[PDB]
């Protein structure tokens, strides 16, 4: 019922998957930030 629907069968060759490594590190995946909320959270709690 995968050759009728045109799907790949679960046995033989389609018993696994190949996926491609992105070869990326955690240094490029950083939340870059400069003076966004450095004071907008500071000037909202003074005596209120």
């Amino acid at each position: 019922e995968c050759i009728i629907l045109g799907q790949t069968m679960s046995i033989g060759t389609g018993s696994f998957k190949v996926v491609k490594g992105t070869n990326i590190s955690e240094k490029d995946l950083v939340p870059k930030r400069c003076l966004f909320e450095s004071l907008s959270n500071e000037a909202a709690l003074k005596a209120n």
């Binding site: 050759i3 069968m9 046995i11 033989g12």
Partner: protein, 68 residues
């Protein structure tokens, strides 16, 4: 070795290769069409039956099933 030589009455039959070479690329009315003299001799043709579907399961080739 000594070789057995002499005449034999041979005979040429029907069933030549010029009216049996049959091929097809894409679409109906195949481009290499044989002569239409079958006479209760439909031996499948350019098909892929369920007996041939069972042979490629034993190989395990899953990407040839979707292609054919």
């Amino acid at each position: 070795a000594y070789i057995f030589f002499g005449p034999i009455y041979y005979q040429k039959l029907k069933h030549m290769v010029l009216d049996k070479m049959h091929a097809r690329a894409r679409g109906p009315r195949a481009v290499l069409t044989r002569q239409p003299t079958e006479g209760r001799s439909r031996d499948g043709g350019l098909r892929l039956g369920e007996m041939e579907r069972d042979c490629v399961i034993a190989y395990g080739a899953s990407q040839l099933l979707l292609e054919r």
